[PDB]
Amino acid sequence: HWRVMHFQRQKLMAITEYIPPKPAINPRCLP
Amino acid sequence: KHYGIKKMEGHYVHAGNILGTQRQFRWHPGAHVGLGRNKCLYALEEGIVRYTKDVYVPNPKNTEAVDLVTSLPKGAVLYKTFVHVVPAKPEGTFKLVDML
Amino acid sequence: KFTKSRIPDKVFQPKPEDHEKYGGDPQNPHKLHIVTRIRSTKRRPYWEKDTIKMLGLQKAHSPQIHKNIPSVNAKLKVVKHLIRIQPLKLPQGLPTEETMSSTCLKSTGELVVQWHLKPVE
Amino acid sequence: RTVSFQAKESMIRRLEVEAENHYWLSMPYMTAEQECGHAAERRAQAFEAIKAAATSKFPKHRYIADQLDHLNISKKWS
Amino acid sequence: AGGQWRLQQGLAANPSGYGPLTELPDWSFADGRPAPPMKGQLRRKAQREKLARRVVLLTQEMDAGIQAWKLRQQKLQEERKKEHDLKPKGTLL
RNA sequence: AUUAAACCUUGUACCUUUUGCAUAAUGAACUAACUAGAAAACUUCUAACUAAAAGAAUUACAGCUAGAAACCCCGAAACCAAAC
RNA sequence: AACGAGCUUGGUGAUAGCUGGUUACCCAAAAAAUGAAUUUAAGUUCAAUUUUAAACUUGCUAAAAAAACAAAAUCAAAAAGUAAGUUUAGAUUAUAGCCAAAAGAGGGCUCUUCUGGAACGGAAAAAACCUUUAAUAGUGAAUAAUUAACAACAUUAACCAUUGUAGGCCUAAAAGCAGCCACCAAUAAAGAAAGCGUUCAAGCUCAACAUAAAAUCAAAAUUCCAUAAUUUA
RNA sequence: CUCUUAUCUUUAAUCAGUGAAAUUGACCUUUCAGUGAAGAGGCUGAAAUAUAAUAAUAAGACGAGAAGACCCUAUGGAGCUUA
RNA sequence: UCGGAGAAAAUCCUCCGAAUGAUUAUAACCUAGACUUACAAGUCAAAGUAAAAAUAUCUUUGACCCAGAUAUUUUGAUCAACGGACCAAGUUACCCUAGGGAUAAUCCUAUUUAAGAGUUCAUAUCGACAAUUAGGGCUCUUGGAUCAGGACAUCCCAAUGGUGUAGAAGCUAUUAAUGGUUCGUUUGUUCAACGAUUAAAGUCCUACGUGAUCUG
Ligand SMILES: [Mg+2]
Ligand SMILES: [Mg+2]
Ligand SMILES: [Mg+2]
Ligand SMILES: [Mg+2]
Ligand SMILES: [Mg+2]
Ligand SMILES: [Mg+2]
Ligand SMILES: [Mg+2]
Ligand SMILES: [Mg+2]
Ligand SMILES: [Mg+2]
Ligand SMILES: [Mg+2]
Ligand SMILES: [Mg+2]
Ligand SMILES: [Mg+2]
Ligand SMILES: [Mg+2]
Ligand SMILES: [Mg+2]
Ligand SMILES: [Mg+2]
Ligand SMILES: [Mg+2]
Ligand SMILES: [Mg+2]
Ligand SMILES: [Mg+2]
Ligand SMILES: [Mg+2]
Ligand SMILES: [Mg+2]
Ligand SMILES: [Mg+2]
Ligand SMILES: [Mg+2]
Ligand SMILES: [Mg+2]
Ligand SMILES: [Mg+2]
Ligand SMILES: [Mg+2]
C-alpha cells in the first residue's frame, strides 16, 4: 500500500520525468 | 520558575533592575552587578548590559576551587561567562549657586 | 512544520546564455520595475498576503511601478510565484511637464510620450 | 491517477514565466550603501500629515440660521 | 481567441484596451460640433498621468541619491590625509 | 424564455439545532384574530447658571441642576395550612 | 375509574444552571471554541481577545553584526516598502469546533505544535481539495482551474563418441558416477565425468571430433453501465 | 398433523338512507447502478413512460398511535432502613 | 495539594520526595528600582539610620470570620475533597419530573518458493523455513412457520485432463448456476450428538431476507 500523493505533488512528478535523447539514424541500418 | 535572562545584551537598564535568574551559577557577577541571596543578578548602575568571557580566579580560602585550579594542566586556564553594566551618565556636575 | 524558507543565493546569479535569451546586458541595469499580480493570495500563508498589500498589488492585471533597489527586491523574492516582472523602457525619453498628459504604456513595456491614435504611415 | 495533457502544459507555461522573474531580479541598480538615506525627507513629511489628522478632532459649529429656518415650514400665499 | 497573436504585434491582448476602437469618440453632432468627453475616457487619462508622475519622482530620487553618496566618499577621502604641528626627534622634542 | 398554457435549459422545501455540513433528526392540515425586554449607580449627548449650582436638609480644588438614553414569555415532580 | 400515600381551595406569577418560543427596513464592524479558579466540567468570575469614543506619537514587514542557547524561537541600529500603534473611559458575548497538509509523542485511533479552507466555476453528485479582491445594469471582449492516459524483443540450433582399468577403500561390488582421496593415459579428440540409470555392472546423456548459422526492465451476492472514435497542419 | 376439502350463518361486494377516527410542510408522488451518516420517488449518469376509476396483496415510505423498556446527567424529588 | 528527575512545551505517561530537622557567634528599623502573578499569595535589593566590630547555613503548606494568651505583642486545622459549607450515611425492580443519548493478531482459502515424505522418483498425492499492492471470516439479540430474490468459492445431475488409472472402486485438477437438495429424536458431549434414508441431504449474501403476515 502506497500512501496517495496530493494531486499537486502528482503533477510535479509527471513533468520532471526522465527524457532520453534519440539518434537520427539507427546504428544497425547504418553501414 | 521561568529561570532565564530577564535583560538581554544591549538594553538600557536602570538601577535595581534584575538581569537574570538561575538555580546554579550559569553566569557570574561582573562590573557594577551584584548578587542576590537566591543568586539572581541585578544592576547597580544605570547603563547598558554586556556579556563577556573572562578568566576565573577563586578566593584562596575556598578549598574546592583551589584544588581544581592547581590541578589544571600548565597549558591553559579555565574560563567563565561574566555580566557587566557600562554606566551611561555623569554622577554630577558643578553649578553656580551664588555670587558673593 | 511548514514555515518561512530561504532561497539559495545561486538562483539569482545569472548565466551568459540567460543574458542572450532575455536580452539584458549585465551592465547598465534598468532602474524601474513593472509588476503585476497574476494569481490569488487565498490559500497562501499570511506573510505573502501582507507583502502583496505593501507593494500595492491588490488588483490583478494592473501594473505598478517600483524601484530596482535591493531593499525592494528582498520583498519581491517572497512573492515571486504570484507576480510578473518586466523592465521599464523609455524609447523617447522621460516625460516632461509638457508631455505628462499624453503618455501611454504599451504591453511591451515602453512608455511612449506621444499618443495620437493615428496610422503610422 | 493520470495527469491530463492540459494540466501538464498549463504548469509548464507558469514555470517559464517564473524563470524570467529570477533573471530580472539579479541586477540591482544601486548597492545597499548607496540606498541609505536617499528617501529620508519624503518619509518624514508623510508621518507629519498622519499625526496632524489624528490630533484635529473637534465638534462642529452651530448656527442661528439652521434653527430659525424651521419656521419656513409654515410659509404660505397670503 | 487571438490574445497571444495580438501581443506579438505589440497590441493589447483584449481588443477593449488601448487603441483607436475604444479610445476615439463614438459620436458627434450633425453640425460638426464635438461631443462632451466620455466619462470612461476622463478616468483613463487621470490614471495614466498619475503613473507618469510617479516615474519621474522615483527616478529623480535614485539619481539624486547616487551623487550624494559619492560626494560623501570624497569628504572621507580628503579627511584621511591630514597632518598638523611638527615632528622633532633626538634628545629633545 | 418563447409566435405559442405544457415539450427545451437551469434548480438537493422551510424554521430550530448540530462541527460554519445535511437525503440527519425536532416543529408545522389550512384561514382569521390574539400571543414574549421592564428599572437610571457610573458613563456619553443637549441646554441653564457658574466659584458656585439647586423652589430648605445635597454635592463641589469647574462644578452643579434639568432633559434624553436599560436589563423577556410558556412549562414540572414537590412542600405546607385549612376544608371536603 | 389516575394512592410508595386521597381530593379541593389558598400560600402561588412556587422553583427549574434543563426543553421550546421571542413580531419592520438599511448601513457598518466582528469573534475563538487559548490560560486560571470553582460540590466545577449542560454553569459562572478573572485574564486574554473584540469593540465604540477621546488624548497624542510612532507602529507593521524587515532586521546586520554580538550575544544568551546548546556547539528557529527570542533580542531590534541604521535603512527601505509602507499606515498604523500606545494611553484613558465605557460595554457585552464567548470559554466543546470540523476536514485537508506537515513534525512529533503514547501503538488505527489519542494527545501537542506550524499552515490553509468554508463558489454562484472545476474534480460525476461534492461543508474542508483546486481556480477566485466587494456589488450593479448590458443580445460586448480577453482569460483561470479543469478524470483521464496512449507483450515481446531490445553467448547457439547441426553432430557425436575409442582407452590404460571396474581408479584405492571395512564398502560382495560399489566400475565417471554411495562414498573416499587421487584424479592422471594414449590418441588430432574424450573430464578417472557435468547429468540420468543401473543390486554393482550395464546401459542413455553432456562436454570433446570435424561441419555450421543467427546476435536488461519496462506501455460476490436486484440489472453491464454515457454514446462513440486510432491521423487535415 | 401427513394434506386438505365440502356446506350453512356472520362479514364482504352491488342498490337505497344516515354518517365517524387516528392521520396530514407542499407534491405535477417511477426503475436500475453510483454517491452518502449500515440509509434516495426527489442529488450524478443511464433507462422507461397517453389519461382516469373499481376490487385485492403488504416489500418500502427509517409507515401511525406507543405515557412501551435499557444508559447517562441535575449542588431536581419522593418512599424505605439505620450504627 | 506542593517540589525534584525523563519523555521534551500534552498525559489516566515513567520515578523519588514534602507537610521538617540540625546547628546558629541572634540577623533592627526604614526605603529607590525590579522579578513572578487572572485575583490572592510569593521572591531580590542600592542609599539613609541604628546596634555591634556587615548575612546563620543547610534546602516544601492553609485565606476570611470567629474564639484565645498575656500586658500589646503574640498563638490556634491530614479545613489533606488541601481557594477551605460551623455541624448530615445507606438503599429503591414500588419508584417520579426535566432533559441528553440511544434503541493489527488469530484463522481458513488462493498464488510463489522447494528442504524433506513418497521402497526407487520434489511437484500422482502431500509438504518444513519462508514469501504473498494476496481474499475472507476479575467481568459482559437470536430460533421456527410462510414465501422466497441473488452470488459461485459446485453437494448431486453434465462435458473433460493427469494418476503410484488392469476391470470395479477411488484420490486430484479444469469448465458450467440447470433444477433439486428428506423424515423423526436427547442418557453423556462448551455453539455437540443419535436413528432411518437419499442420486444429493452444498457454502454463503440479502437491517434474525421476511413480527403494519403469524409465533417461541
Ligand atoms: Mg429522539
Ligand atoms: Mg408533526
Ligand atoms: Mg395571523
Ligand atoms: Mg419560570
Ligand atoms: Mg486554542
Ligand atoms: Mg469546595
Ligand atoms: Mg451546569
Ligand atoms: Mg529601527
Ligand atoms: Mg351506501
Ligand atoms: Mg406522474
Ligand atoms: Mg440506489
Ligand atoms: Mg435520480
Ligand atoms: Mg408496505
Ligand atoms: Mg390488511
Ligand atoms: Mg416510525
Ligand atoms: Mg455541578
Ligand atoms: Mg436537593
Ligand atoms: Mg430541596
Ligand atoms: Mg544598604
Ligand atoms: Mg475541592
Ligand atoms: Mg480545590
Ligand atoms: Mg421483587
Ligand atoms: Mg430461490
Ligand atoms: Mg468454477
Ligand atoms: Mg415487516
UniProtKB/Swiss-Prot annotation, chain A:
State the compartments where it is located: Mitochondrion
| Entry superkingdom | Eukaryota
Its subunit composition reads: Component of the mitochondrial ribosome large subunit (39S) which comprises a 16S rRNA and about 50 distinct proteins.
| Similarity comment | Belongs to the universal ribosomal protein uL10 family.
Protein name as catalogued: Large ribosomal subunit protein uL10m
* Provenance organism: Mus musculus
Q: Gene that codes for this?
A: Mrpl10
UniProtKB/Swiss-Prot annotation, chain B:
Q: What is one Gene Ontology biological process annotated in the Swiss-Prot or TrEMBL record?
A: translation
The similarity annotation says: Belongs to the bacterial ribosomal protein bL27 family.
GO MF annotations for this entry?
structural constituent of ribosome
The lineage, from the top, is: Eukaryota, Metazoa, Chordata, Craniata, Vertebrata
Q: What is its main location?
A: mitochondrion
* Any Gene Ontology CC annotation: mitochondrial inner membrane
Q: Where in the cell is it found?
A: Mitochondrion
This one is known as Large ribosomal subunit protein bL27m
| Keyword Nucleotide-binding among UniProt keywords | no
- Subunit relationships: Component of the mitochondrial ribosome large subunit (39S) which comprises a 16S rRNA and about 50 distinct proteins.
Annotated keywords: Mitochondrion, Ribonucleoprotein, Ribosomal protein, Transit peptide
Swiss-Prot record, chain C:
Please give the family membership noted in the entry: Belongs to the universal ribosomal protein uL30 family.
Q: How does it assemble?
A: Component of the mitochondrial ribosome large subunit (39S) which comprises a 16S rRNA and about 50 distinct proteins.
What does the UniProt keyword field contain?
A: Mitochondrion, Ribonucleoprotein, Ribosomal protein, Transit peptide
Q: Which organism is it from?
A: Mus musculus
Gene Ontology MF terms in the entry: structural constituent of ribosome
The alphabetized list of GO BP terms reads: mitochondrial translation
Q: Which GO terms describe its cellular component?
A: mitochondrial inner membrane; mitochondrial large ribosomal subunit; mitochondrial ribosome; mitochondrion
The name this protein carries in UniProt is: Large ribosomal subunit protein uL30m
Renumbered to this chain, region (Disordered) spans: 10-30
Q: Where in the cell is it found?
A: Mitochondrion
Keyword Transit peptide recorded = yes
UniProtKB/Swiss-Prot annotation, chain E:
Tell me which UniProt keywords the record has, alphabetically: Mitochondrion, Ribonucleoprotein, Ribosomal protein, Transit peptide
| Biased composition, class Basic and acidic residues, residue ranges | 77-88
Q: Tell me the segments the record calls region Disordered.
A: 77-93
Question: One MF term in GO for this entry?
Answer: structural constituent of ribosome
> What cellular-component terms does GO give this entry?
mitochondrial inner membrane; mitochondrial large ribosomal subunit; mitochondrion; nucleoplasm
Where found? Mitochondrion
One of its GO biological process terms is: mitochondrial translation
**What does the subunit comment say?**
Component of the mitochondrial ribosome large subunit (39S) which comprises a 16S rRNA and about 50 distinct proteins.
Family stated for the protein in its record: Belongs to the mitochondrion-specific ribosomal protein mL52 family.
Query: What protein does this entry describe?
Result: Large ribosomal subunit protein mL52
Q: Which species is this UniProt entry from? A: Mus musculus (Mouse)
What range of the full-length protein does this chain span?
22 to 114 of 121
